[PDB]
Scaffold this active site. Sequence first.
Site, mmCIF file in Angstrom:
data_model
loop_
_atom_site.group_PDB
_atom_site.id
_atom_site.type_symbol
_atom_site.label_atom_id
_atom_site.label_comp_id
_atom_site.label_asym_id
_atom_site.label_seq_id
_atom_site.Cartn_x
_atom_site.Cartn_y
_atom_site.Cartn_z
ATOM 1 N N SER C 117 61.603 61.083 24.797
ATOM 2 C CA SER C 117 60.359 60.742 24.117
ATOM 3 C C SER C 117 59.445 60.110 25.152
ATOM 4 O O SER C 117 59.734 59.016 25.643
ATOM 5 C CB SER C 117 60.607 59.797 22.952
ATOM 6 N N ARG C 118 58.347 60.789 25.489
ATOM 7 C CA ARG C 118 57.481 60.283 26.548
ATOM 8 C C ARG C 118 56.914 58.916 26.197
ATOM 9 O O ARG C 118 56.799 58.046 27.069
ATOM 10 C CB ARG C 118 56.345 61.260 26.827
ATOM 11 N N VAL C 119 56.540 58.704 24.936
ATOM 12 C CA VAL C 119 55.950 57.420 24.566
ATOM 13 C C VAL C 119 56.943 56.295 24.828
ATOM 14 O O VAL C 119 56.598 55.265 25.418
ATOM 15 C CB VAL C 119 55.474 57.439 23.102
ATOM 16 N N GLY C 120 58.191 56.484 24.418
ATOM 17 C CA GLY C 120 59.237 55.531 24.728
ATOM 18 C C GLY C 120 58.893 54.110 24.339
ATOM 19 O O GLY C 120 58.832 53.775 23.153
#
Lengths: 55, 47, 128
Positions: C117-120
Site C-alpha cells: 500500500s503506497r500510502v502506508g
Amino acid sequence: ATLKDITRRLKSIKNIQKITKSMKMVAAAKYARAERELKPARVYGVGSLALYEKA
Amino acid sequence: VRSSAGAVRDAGGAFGKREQAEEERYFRARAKEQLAALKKHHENEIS
Amino acid sequence: YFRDNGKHALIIYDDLSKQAVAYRQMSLLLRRPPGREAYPGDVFYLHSRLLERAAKMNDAFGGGSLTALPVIETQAGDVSAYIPTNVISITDGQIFLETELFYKGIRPAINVGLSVSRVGSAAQTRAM
C-alpha cells in the site's frame, strides 16, 4: 505452470543434482578412508571386549 | 537449456525457503554470540 | 457524483477481468484487429481511464473522495498474466490472496509478505 516457472524449476533441480553427485563422491572417498581405518580398530575393540565374553 | 549459479533461490520453491531459513537461523545465532562478545569487550574496556 | 458533491464513496469492481473479456468480445465483433491474447490494443486504456477517476478532491473542490477496490482473478496464481499486470501497474496497492494460505488455515488469505500500500503511514489511525 508458465514457461518461466518451468525454466526456473528445471535450473534449480539441475543444480541440486550436481550438488548431490559431488557429495556422493566426497562421501565415497571418506568411506574408503573410514573402512581402511576401521580394520585395525575392529581388531583392537574386539580384543578389548574379549574379557567379558570370555569370563 | 542450462543451469546457473544461485538458481535454487531463484525458483523460490521449497528448497529456496528451506535454504533461506537454514542461513537465517545460523546467522542469527552467530550475531547473538558476536553481540555478547561485543558487550563483554565494551564492559572490559571502560577503564 | 458523490465525490463531486463533497461526500465520500467506495466502489468495488468485481471483476475487472470480466470487463476485459466483454470488451474483447465487443472489439472482435466490430472487426477491430486483435492484440496479445486476442485482447484489443486499448485494453490498458480501458482500465487506466476507469481507475484514474478514484480521486481525493481537495477542500476547494468539496473535499469528497472515491475509493476503488478492483477485483482481479489470476489463473493458478499467474500474477504475470496480461490483465493482472496491467491493473497492478495501474493501481496503488495490492492485496494478494493465495490458495496455499487459504487451505493452510489462514483466512483471509492475505499474503502480507507481498501485499503493498503506497500510502502506508498516512491514512492510518495513530493507535493502529
